[PDB]
Amino acid sequence: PNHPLWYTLCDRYGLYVVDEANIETHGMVPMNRLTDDPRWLPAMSERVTRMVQRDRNHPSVIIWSLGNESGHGANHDALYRWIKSVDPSRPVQYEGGGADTTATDIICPMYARVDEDQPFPAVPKWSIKKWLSLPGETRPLILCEYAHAMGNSLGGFAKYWQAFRQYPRLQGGFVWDWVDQSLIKYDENGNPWSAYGGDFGDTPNDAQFCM
Amino acid sequence: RLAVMVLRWSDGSYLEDQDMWRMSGIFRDVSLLHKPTTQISDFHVATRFNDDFSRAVLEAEVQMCGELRDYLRVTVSLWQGETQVASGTAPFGGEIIDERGGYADRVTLRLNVENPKLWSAEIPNLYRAVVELHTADGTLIEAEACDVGFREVRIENGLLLLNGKPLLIRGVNRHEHHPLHGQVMDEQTMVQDILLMKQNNFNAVRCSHY
Numbered sequence: 127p128n129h130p131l132w133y134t135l136c137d138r139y140g141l142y143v144v145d146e147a148n149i150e151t152h153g154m155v156p157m158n159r160l161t162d163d164p165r166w167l168p169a170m171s172e173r174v175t176r177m178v179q180r181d182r183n184h185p186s187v188i189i190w191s192l193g194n195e196s197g198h199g200a201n202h203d204a205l206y207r208w209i210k211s212v213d214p215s216r217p218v219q220y221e222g223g224g225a226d227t228t229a230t231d232i233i234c235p236m237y238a239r240v241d242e243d244q245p246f247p248a249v250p251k252w253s254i255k256k257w258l259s260l261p262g263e264t265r266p267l268i269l270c271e272y273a274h275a276m277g278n279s280l281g282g283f284a285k286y287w288q289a290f291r292q293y294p295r296l297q298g299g300f301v302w303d304w305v306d307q308s309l310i311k312y313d314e315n316g317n318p319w320s321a322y323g324g325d326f327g328d329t330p331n332d333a334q335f336c337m
Numbered sequence: 338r339l340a341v342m343v344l345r346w347s348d349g350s351y352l353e354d355q356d357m358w359r360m361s362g363i364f365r366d367v368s369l370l371h372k373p374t375t376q377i378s379d380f381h382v383a384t385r386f387n388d389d390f391s392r393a394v395l396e397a398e399v400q401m402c403g404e405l406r407d408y409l410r411v412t413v414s415l416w417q418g419e420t421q422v423a424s425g426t427a428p429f430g431g432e433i434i435d436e437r438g439g440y441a442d443r444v445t446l447r448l449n450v451e452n453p454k455l456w457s458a459e460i461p462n463l464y465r466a467v468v469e470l471h472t473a474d475g476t477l478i479e480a481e482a483c484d485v486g487f488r489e490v491r492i493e494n495g496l497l498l499l500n501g502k503p504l505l506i507r508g509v510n511r512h513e514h515h516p517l518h519g520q521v522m523d524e525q526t527m528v529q530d531i532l533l534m535k536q537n538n539f540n541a542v543r544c545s546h547y
């Protein structure tokens with residue numbers, strides 16, 4: 127959830143917002159080790175329920191998100207149903223566990239390509255065009271993350287938009303991401319320079335991946 | 338002496354506007370068929386399966402024409418080579434279908450078949466079904482027959498399945514055409530086409546358009 131003023135500005139300037147619970151357990155092995163554990167349902171529940179109680183009156187918020195990269199656990203299904211029950215005015219989405227689980231109203235993969243399939247075991251990232259028509263699938267597809275803009279990037283961006291415009295059920299996505307997470311450091315003469323992972327003696331670190 | 342007046346054009350022509358040579362005449366076989374007064378006028382063969390196709394039930398509905406008699410019987414026997422695998426016998430008189438009764442001139446035979454050899458383009462396993470119309474005492478009146486292929490065709494969850502598996506149609510449309518005989522087909526040419534088709538990895542054909 128963002129600083130409260132963000133929603134006010136989005137309401138007034140006009141931007142669709144996906145409000146997301148502060149829940150990410152990416153480093154766990156497997157990713158859903160905590161989210162599928164009932165002992166952690168209470169903690170997760172508060173991060174979801176309290177977000178909804180705070181921002182439910184903002185028109186800019188059009189979609190609720192259960193969090194990010196925490197695999198798919200029973201706790202997600204429980205919280206998915208909680209939101210659907212208390213606020214039926216907004217679809218609920220969540221990418222963990224394969225982007226098309228029972229905990230999401232929208233197929234919301236991250237970095238699924240336009241024409242190329244990436245058949246990862248258990249959590250494949252199908253070509254978005256192919257994903258829409260898999261047997262029994264009827265949901266709209268909106269990439270929660272795509273076109274990773276790290277350094278000199280965004281090659282192939284047009285391929286996504288040509289597909290978005292051609293396919294009714296391909297309804298866009300959210301580019302990753304808006305602003306480089308570089309921090310200011312100063313040399314011996316006080317002149318500032320942009321720093322990334324590891325520049326503060328922090329280790330282990332993932333260097334430039336924050337930009 | 339037979340007299341046949343064939344018209345090239347007819348109201349039927351309005352329904353026969355296929356993209357092909359427009360010809361006319363008696364272009365297919367002509368034959369004489371002798372059937373007993375008490376006869377098999379129709380018969381349908383169906384094959385149902387359990388979930389993994391390890392079991393099947395062959396259901397054959399048979400219709401007769403002529404005088405109904407309590408001594409009449411129909412025996413449907415299924416063969417795999419010279420080995421009889423199943424057989425069913427019964428008198429006429431179908432089950433009740435409505436307030437006025439059922440079909441007294443029909444009978445449905447149901448034969449159980451364990452571990453049936455399944456038919457597909459990959460392996461065209463075939464059984465032979467013989468439909469015998471006879472007296473209770475065993476006097477044969479007449480017999481009809483057909484090749485039987487055990488297979489289930491169905492669309493489930495958006496996929497066309499044959500015996501539970503999704504097909505990949507490697508097909509071709511085929512008209513009945515011969516450069517010298519026109520639209521008259523012969524066994525030699527039909528076989529030639531089928532051999533060439535399978536030799537070129539085709540597994541399906543559409544009867545364009547009739």
Ligand SMILES: CC(C)S[C@@H]1O[C@H](CO)[C@H](O)[C@H](O)[C@H]1O
Nearest residue numbers: 195236271274276302335336337
């Ligand atoms: C590094 C990959 C194995 S995971 C990948 O890293 C990216 C770094 O910008 C983003 O955080 C993506 O959301 C994440 O899935």
Ligand SMILES: CC(C)S[C@@H]1O[C@H](CO)[C@H](O)[C@H](O)[C@H]1O
Nearest residue numbers: 457458459460461462463535538
């Ligand atoms: C090379 C094959 C596709 S030919 C195929 O093999 C089958 C057995 O596997 C059966 O014998 C079929 O009758 C035969 O046509």
Ligand SMILES: [Mg+2]
Nearest residue numbers: 354355356357
């Ligand atoms: Mg035409």
Ligand SMILES: [Mg+2]
Nearest residue numbers: 387389391392
């Ligand atoms: Mg069994």
Ligand code: NA
Nearest residue numbers: 290293294296
């Ligand atoms: Na679209």
Ligand code: NA
Nearest residue numbers: 334335336337
């Ligand atoms: Na990053």
